[PDB]
Design a protein around this ligand. Sequence first.
Ligand SMILES: [Ca+2]
Ligand SMILES: [Ca+2]
Lengths: 475, 476
Amino acid sequence: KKPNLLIVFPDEMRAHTLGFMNQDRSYTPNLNKFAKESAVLKQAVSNFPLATPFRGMLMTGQYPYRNGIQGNSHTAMPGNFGGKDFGIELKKSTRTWSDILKDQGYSMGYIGKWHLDTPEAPFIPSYNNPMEGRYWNDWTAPDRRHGFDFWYAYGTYDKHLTPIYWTNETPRDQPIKVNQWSPEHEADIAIKYLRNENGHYRDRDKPFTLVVSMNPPHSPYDQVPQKYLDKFDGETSRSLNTRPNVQWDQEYLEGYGPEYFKEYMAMVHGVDDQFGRIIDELDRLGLTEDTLVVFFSDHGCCMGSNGKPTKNVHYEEAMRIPMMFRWPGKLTPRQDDLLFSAPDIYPTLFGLMGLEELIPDTVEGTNFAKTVSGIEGDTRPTSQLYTFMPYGGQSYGRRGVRTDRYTLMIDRKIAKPLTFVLHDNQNDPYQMTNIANDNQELIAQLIEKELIPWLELTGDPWRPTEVPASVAKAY
Amino acid sequence: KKPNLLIVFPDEMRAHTLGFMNQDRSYTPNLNKFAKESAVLKQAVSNFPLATPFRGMLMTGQYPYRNGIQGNSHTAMPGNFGGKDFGIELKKSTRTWSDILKDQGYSMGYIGKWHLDTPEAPFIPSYNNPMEGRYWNDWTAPDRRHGFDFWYAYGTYDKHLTPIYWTNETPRDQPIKVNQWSPEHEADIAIKYLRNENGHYRDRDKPFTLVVSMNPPHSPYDQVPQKYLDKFDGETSRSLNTRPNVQWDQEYLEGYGPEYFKEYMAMVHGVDDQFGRIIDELDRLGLTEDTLVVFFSDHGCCMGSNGKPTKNVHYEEAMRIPMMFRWPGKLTPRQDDLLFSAPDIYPTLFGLMGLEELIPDTVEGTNFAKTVSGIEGDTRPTSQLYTFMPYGGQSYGRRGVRTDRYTLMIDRKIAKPLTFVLHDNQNDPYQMTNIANDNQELIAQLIEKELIPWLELTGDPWRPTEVPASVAKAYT
Ligand SMILES: [Ca+2]
Ligand SMILES: [Ca+2]
């Protein structure tokens, strides 16, 4: 009766990698089939396209300004700065949707990358503890798992072929060290959770929520199984990465950029294979009709498009994420260009499951269960907020809006003119031209109709005005 | 049957000015009598002791970080910075307690100083439009009055003897220009609201909320009726301002500081008189038992105590505010030392009125209606948050905690060691000594047990750590 919830989301998988989207030269047969059984939001975005900010929005239904999860949740070495110096973490006292489902009588499981805690001293052994001025990895202590009674997760760790996990059984100092591609290992654990063979993964009498947060197709690109690379045998990153806005002649940081596109596509194929294993097991078990399945990613990846290596930019390749909802017998398959945003996920899931009344007032996103279900009545957004927040600078950085036609981005520094970037996504679908100059009137309307209303709705203090050097005098 | 709500609050009146407190040498007979009939919260504070931040907390029950009302709501001149550059204003889409009460079927009236909107161009004529690089005054348009269907109010305007107001009947370009001390004029309007002769002010069949927001004893100090000054004939500012921590030889901005203490006491006395007039009319009309009456202020005023002229500091004279609830037949008179905070006002009032189920999840303050009613069982706070937020610097500035014994304040700047100020308020009642250096372990305990939990509760990203100069390179 009470519905189950299965959430699968890989990391850094742009919507363009979905084969049925007719964009990237990719091979995702399992997700293609899933899409034709699902209600697909084809215009969904990650408003702050960065892992930790997105997970903040997923767990809280709030935008970054009020949830405080405004960057990476890392911890500085002495003389440096990191997320911990600005409260960037999911707080123990925060009531997430996973807390609420737990109190509704659910068994709750989380598999994979958590990426929401700041590491604490003494820091655990880890190749990234420290790395580039910061400590990055730690377990999640049991009192910080927000209702997930089954745990099989880590903080941040990118060695895809040798992942490490903490579980109900592990103490902090002895995690499970795995020799297996992490998506496959995570699919294996998901299968066992779904089967619940010994009865100790979850309660037989309760509904369940399982989250599987895969790391690939996130970098690095040298930890991909040969099996999945073999799917693109004979092709190269050049022959595969054909998007017109790719800048091959830009200089990229070692290990990143369009020359790794073949590896990216192979990881996408690999994740598609493992997603298929999980869904096939769900259906083999007879759980298809009682389980709402949702697939998305935390942000996209530019892979050289417009000269950007990965994410954390306003471009379509970083903002656009998959978003699909499958529930055969209760959701009719469809596609919709709803301007969906990351804080809408939480309340929309609650709406779909019949739990609208449990959405607290603190949620800033919108319940679009009606639109997903093909039912009239939602107010359709005219824009999606874009944001980049520099550490400690909530009143500065980049803000922008994405409408059904334009992407506008504004950068704000102290004592400098505002920089404007404007794309006509209709005439310029690959966002290769900035038309901000001599579009003052259109930009003014976008600011007045879209950006300011989002900023006021979220409490964000950023405003599109210059400020003199004296404003920083005080601090 | 549904209770009325009368809120009266003057500006910049520290708790120490109440005669029954046995602190300042003040004459407040009407407030002394009101106190003997009320539930009095003797330790209430304004956590961000500045006008517009307090009003933000009053209307939203949220702390400043999440409500965004983090400074003065003024508008900069070209080349300057103001509140408007950082969203510092009540947003039209924000649902306040006044919006909620309106939907419950109340008549809602606001008299006096609003001080919650940024001025818009073209800027109305006003002595402070501009003043010191910013525009300060404007009306409040009908769609921004948040359920207050009777309006008699202004934005920011300190000419206490010639105030200006907008009402339902006034366009932006012709306000009402008054020649009368603002608290007296506002008491006049409030009495007319309560009488409601011929039904012009409110619906006789609805409960009402009336807010009277007075400006005195806020500066300036040369706009006081001579009548009120005459009460202190034979005294001087020197003879009245005897607090041991007053620093007479500090350098003060022209028109501020301890030499204006007589004027300050005279305004307090004047406001007490006018408060008495409003309460007497309410009781004469037989509304006493159906009306919850609340008196507070938005912040205190140091008046030279510890060398500070006015507010926006952690000292007791700036943080401590009056706070009294009268409702004869429902609230037994009492005195309580609860560590009450400004975001608690809204939910506590809803609690007292039987409206606790209407408090939204966004409210961060706590409903202490039981404590105010003398009923045991509330979780008593162990501290009150202090905050100073520089314009555009939500991660920096001063933060602190006030407990039943200590006040700790920490100031955080980019590429600087933290500065620590600690007062033992028990042994150093006037906070004249900073004992921070000899109490490193106590400070660690206060940060861990009090400050960090408040910061996490409020979402405030400020943390007590040094950050290097490089942190600002991304946005300078
Ligand atoms: Ca990510
Ligand atoms: Ca004030």
